[PDB]
Symmetry: D2
């Protein structure tokens, strides 16, 4: 028998609503979308606005107001609820209030009988991913965070604009914390099959331009927050892509919040951090391990140690 695939969204603010809109437009078999928000009226209005556009979609989809009960037979639970950062605030300044919000959300979600896959976007996303795994008691491979997918998308856009080359051919990652301590894989970067070192040697880009691009990646959230209050379009597309990759069993490699336990030298273990992993219908299929340059490995270790600090204080 054929099945009805169900996604429950928890948190109907800018990020969640953008994700839901994008998913209705570009849908890899999501038959039911259930929206949950502690602000009941916001969720109701978003459900209405999404349903009023069905005539313009490629496919019809069931979009419903829901409660935690709906998670019982959900295949995916997307969590975007929590406080976002205000001007002058880091993502780590949200750890305490957002962890308390996630203790409550994860209890309800677990008590309903949910046994699908978690997709976490709330900040700080790596620590919130670890918290989801611990509170839920779920296997490590059924808990996914968006990690550095958004930072990587920003990096690839900036490089695409610099070289006037489609983002599809920009093979570079942001790894580490989804935050101030991230780093770019400059030494492993290629444009199609042409290494970045050849572009540097040819004077088509400079090392300080690389430093500036990485700093723009790091500061992008702060800039967009100053300009329009919060970021939601790019993260909405990233979540949509993760969801479709899961439902489609696409076995695609993405730089997500991945649980490391021996990879990248093993100096730091048992944390979630921005790193490449294979995604499929069962969740994470494998957390990859590849050699990165010594300086880049020191940056990775420093970022992972920063994360481990917060994990140890709880």
């Amino acid at each position: 028998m054929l099945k009805s695939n169900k996604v429950v969204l928890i948190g109907a603010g800018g990020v969640g609503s953008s994700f839901a809109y994008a998913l209705t437009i570009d849908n890899s078999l999501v038959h039911e979308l259930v929206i949950i928000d502690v602000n009941e009226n916001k969720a109701k209005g978003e459900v209405m606005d999404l349903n009023h556009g069905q005539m313009f979609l490629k496919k019809n989809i069931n979009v419903l107001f829901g409660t935690y009960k709906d998670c019982a037979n959900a295949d995916i639970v997307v969590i975007t609820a929590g406080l976002n950062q205000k001007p002058g605030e880091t993502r780590l300044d949200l750890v305490d209030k957002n962890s308390k919000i996630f203790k409550d959300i994860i209890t309800n979600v677990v008590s309903s009988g949910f046994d699908g896959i978690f997709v976490v976007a709330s900040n700080p996303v790596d620590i919130m991913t670890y918290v989801t795994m611990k509170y839920s008691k779920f296997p490590i491979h059924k808990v996914i965070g968006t990690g550095t997918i958004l930072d990587t998308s920003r990096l690839r856009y900036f490089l695409s604009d610099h070289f006037n080359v489609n983002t599809q051919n920009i093979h570079s990652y942001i790894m580490g914390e989804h935050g101030d301590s991230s780093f770019a894989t400059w030494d492993e970067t290629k444009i199609a099959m042409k290494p970045l070192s050849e572009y540097l040697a040819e004077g088509k880009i400079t090392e300080l331009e690389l430093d500036e691009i990485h700093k723009k990646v790091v500061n992008a959230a702060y800039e967009v927050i100053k300009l329009k209050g919060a970021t939601y379009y790019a993260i909405g597309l990233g979540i949509k892509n993760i969801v479709n990759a899961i439902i489609g069993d696409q076995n695609v490699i993405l730089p997500i919040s991945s649980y490391i336990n021996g990879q990248y030298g093993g100096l730091i273990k048992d944390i979630y951090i921005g790193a490449p992993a294979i995604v499929c219908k069962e969740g994470v299929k494998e957390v990859l391990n590849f050699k990165i340059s010594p300086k880049e490995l020191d940056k990775f270790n420093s970022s992972a140690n920063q994360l481990k600090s917060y994990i140890d204080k709880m």
Copy 2:
């Protein structure tokens, strides 16, 4: 010689930003999108947030922050600028305020050298379409408004849920003013090829339920605004579909703001009103005419009389 297709968006609020997002996701050959707003910080932030997600799109697209000089070589100009209605404000006061804003907008656009197609969504949409045509001097067929496309989408969603049939197969229109004096084409409505009269005969639905549906359509915007502050997702998809129909030269029939001068009895002439028209690459190719029932014609003439009353004043 292949060309670069350029769309300029004026007004980066909820409607305009939602349209731009939807267009980048489902893009029928827009190479360059230019976003303009009197609040330039908002426009900058939306440009950045839209660009940061390029890695997740099917196609790359140039999204830019611009000025009115960018309209010179634009192919389409989408206008979503102006005020949305507030409590205690009739359609007359918004007509006044928004026509005064459009004078400035259209003056700058036309002075830039623009000679493309106008797509208008600011409310009251039919009157603002008339105003755009009068201020711009453009041929009537080069000025399009969204008309009752959103009301028709709401109607077809309601009917699809009632009969549990895909919106694709709900053949019914909302016509007249985009507002309180609109009406449904009940007597000409079909579900696939089965007339609504048959469903009525079989107790599949009742006249009361039909009145209920029409009033749901009339009050949808008020409900959504109560619940979440504004509507923008469904209107964004509608505008995206219009723009793609134009660039794709699809010759598709839609219930837009159409210029009547003889159709539907011809008792009211020389106004834009929600009615079916064929849309193609050069704009409106034909405003159609078909027989509606006498009671529905009474409703149509009343709505057109209302719109003509507001126009003649100025």
Copy 3:
């Protein structure tokens, strides 16, 4: 838990391979496509040629060379095996040959343990749908034939070309036997919301032109076969759309081979004939019933009698 949707294709000729190609390009979550043919070299070559293009697809898909063992857990079985016709599709000789082929195919499929949905395209498609239902003993709502979907596609193309209007807005059907006894629903046809009778009265089309268009629909297959040897592109798309509507649970109304039992004047009963029905994840959800004009009802009854007599002689 999430599942892998499995489609088995029996018959890897022009029609089957066209359908498989179109499905790989436009895929509503088919995870596994299995191809079977009594000519195993042909099935293998098609599997290889379809897999060699995965790089260019939106989504990866597992394309497999199969045996009947693969039907055990298949969700849909598409049958396009059988002799293609230079002369009459509904020859009693062709009926006999393809009935003998279907006996073997259905026996092997059913002995595999399959319990999904049959989608039949082999000719004569209405009688082959009947034979599939009889040999398999499946519920009638789990046996689908393509019926007059192809004839309706041709009709809507011809009308779209006549009026220079998108096929989207052409609301007309071909009904009755997929072949020489079919008829068009001229008296119920609409262009968008405009009845065809209004176009006739305005001189934009004539009765003779309607007759000629219907004869073009009837002679299309013969002409295409004369020119290029066989037809497979339009029918491949029709099969693809049926499959995607089923897996997407879209509740869409399609003119398929439907099991008639009282509808349309309850004269002929218990045969498969071209008629509109609601398609969903469950199979056929309902055969629709609406009033046709007396002349068209007579055409329909004559077509049904044609079919029943050919079933008798089998």
Copy 4:
């Protein structure tokens, strides 16, 4: 302002017909498709079969039978005409006859007033691309051949199946002549960011397995021809993607038939060979140059020397 993008297809065999089909299904705005074949009946039949499925397509498209006269205002001309291999023949046996055919076709097209972009697929594709350039006297950037895009697609499918990873993450090329002298960029290959050398070290792939995969790439065409008479699905998708990337001004890097005059050492110059280049609205924006291993450079220079040996004999 907005235009109708016109593609003329010359050669309506399996390759051309598959490309046309795929294009109608996945269309980056091609408003008019014109089909030319010296066998007028085959072209007519293909036009009819393609048009009879418009109702199932996302967008309507104008498909017409035509003559050389129709290239006058064409934006793109795709050439798929000429002899195919058949069992026992290499692709280099066909040079003489196909060069004669191409002389005829190019002369007619150029005489028609066409000044757009050629896209060449007929075999041997590198030599036929060179011949198109020479006979047409067009700028080099106006002439595109499919080169090793098909070989690369086969390679990426084989590696995707071996590692069970999406083709999207397989970064490897086939370069050199589309034929028996090609080679794979093993030393520069990555699965996402993970070099192939690490998979070899970890025993997840072996040197003999790389040898075998390249041999499979080289013998794929012979095997598929033996099994079903000819290859056309994978090549059709490749052509479709080139066309959509041109019209979409996507600036994508593809391994196509590129004109070399200094790259990859100065050894062989002034020929077309399988190599990466940037494709955009104007044609070829830039032929890339990147370092490959010394043994692979030897292979590249031997392949190029063979192609030069053929070009000099004429």
